[PDB]
Design a protein around this ligand. Structure first.
Ligand SMILES: CCN(CCN)c1ccc(Nc2cc(NC3CC3)n3ncc(C#N)c3n2)cc1-n1cnnc1
Length: 330
């Protein structure tokens, strides 16, 4: 069998809370009035929902409405419970209301509106400083949610709303998030391919908050190297091959051995033998202004196969890459 694992931080936070904090199947939903909201226009479509801009006609406020497609009752309550537990936390989107849509007869979550700067434009005109600033802001959201016993499990650029004009960032889409419990085996079929931690790719189910720290490293690498996505896999197997061509195969096999992981035999014919590369090989004239010794040191400490050896959010926030941002924010 695989060797068990516990988070190194915030291990027992949910155990020390009353059961109703994390026992979301027992949550009863508070329904608002659906007639308070008039849809203005469609913003997005997905496997699990459609998202609209709306107006609250009661106070004339602009709002965002997520109308769910069919999803298990318990996962609806999971997303709602997590959003309520995290309300008022730094850089976490606020759930403002929940209503029963009369057309789909399904739940609609009502969120604060963020005036999102176009991802493409923003990602092309970010300064080194801007990246440090916004990474710092994401880390606050992750440290808060992790300290509150919650893993996001879907960190990636499109789940980070940034209003660049107001220097305002919100981490959104808590529909994959879960409560961390020591010893629990979780579904590995989470996160988008390019952001999946190695634990997910080798089917190690006893994972924790550190999953989010891998995803964050993937975002950071793409921003500083201007390479989107950084690990560009063709499928879930080839994703680990792409990681292995950068992090090397030696540390991968040490990871497999240490946790006694049974590797899908498909992998043996494709992983090969690969040295760990130096980061300088992704540095080019066009991205040089975004790369610093500090950034590379920071990145290196996020992107580890061994989930126990990655920086925590709080450690990350203490790294020299953020020394100028921390000083200015005081
Ligand atoms: C439906 C598919 N998903 C996939 C997510 N990976 C999806 C697609 C688009 C959107 N868009 C927006 C847009 C905006 N603001 C700007 C355009 C005016 N805001 N502001 C706040 C929120 C939220 N919460 C939001 N959302 C939001 C989501 N979304 C949010 N939460 N779950 C899904």
């Amino acid at each position: 069998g695989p060797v068990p694992s516990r988070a190194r931080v915030y291990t027992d936070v949910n155990t020390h809370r009353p059961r109703e904090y994390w026992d979301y199947e027992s949550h009863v939903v508070e329904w608002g009035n659906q007639d308070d909201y008039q849809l203005v226009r469609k913003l997005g479509r997905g496997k699990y929902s459609e998202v609209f801009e709306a107006i609250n006609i009661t106070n004339n406020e602009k709002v965002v409405v997520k109308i769910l497609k069919p999803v298990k009752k318990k996962k609806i309550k999971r997303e709602i419970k997590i959003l309520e537990n995290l309300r008022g936390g730094p850089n976490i989107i606020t759930l403002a209301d929940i209503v029963k849509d009369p057309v789909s007869r399904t739940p609609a979550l009502v969120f604060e509106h963020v005036n999102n700067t176009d991802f493409k434009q923003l990602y092309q005109t970010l300064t080194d400083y801007d990246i440090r600033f916004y990474m710092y802001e994401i880390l606050k959201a992750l440290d808060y949610c992790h300290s509150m016993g919650i893993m996001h499990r879907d960190v990636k650029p499109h789940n980070v709303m940034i209003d660049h004009e107001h220097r305002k960032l919100r981490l959104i889409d808590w529909g994959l998030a879960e409560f961390y419990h020591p010893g629990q085996e979780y579904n590995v079929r989470v996160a988008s391919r390019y952001f999946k931690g190695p634990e997910l790719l080798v089917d190690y189910q006893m994972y924790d908050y550190s999953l989010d720290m891998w995803s964050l490293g993937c975002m950071l690498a793409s921003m500083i190297f201007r390479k989107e996505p950084f690990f560009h896999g063709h499928d879930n197997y080839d994703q680990l091959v792409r990681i292995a061509k950068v992090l090397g195969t030696e540390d991968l096999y040490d990871y497999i051995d240490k946790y006694n992981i049974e590797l899908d035999p498909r992998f043996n014919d494709i992983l090969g033998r690969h040295s760990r590369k130096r980061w300088e090989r992704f540095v080019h004239s066009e991205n040089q202004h975004l790369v610093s010794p500090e950034a590379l040191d920071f990145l290196d400490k996020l992107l580890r196969y061994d989930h126990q050896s990655r920086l925590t959010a709080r450690e990350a926030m203490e790294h020299p890459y953020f020394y100028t941002v921390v000083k200015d924010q005081a």
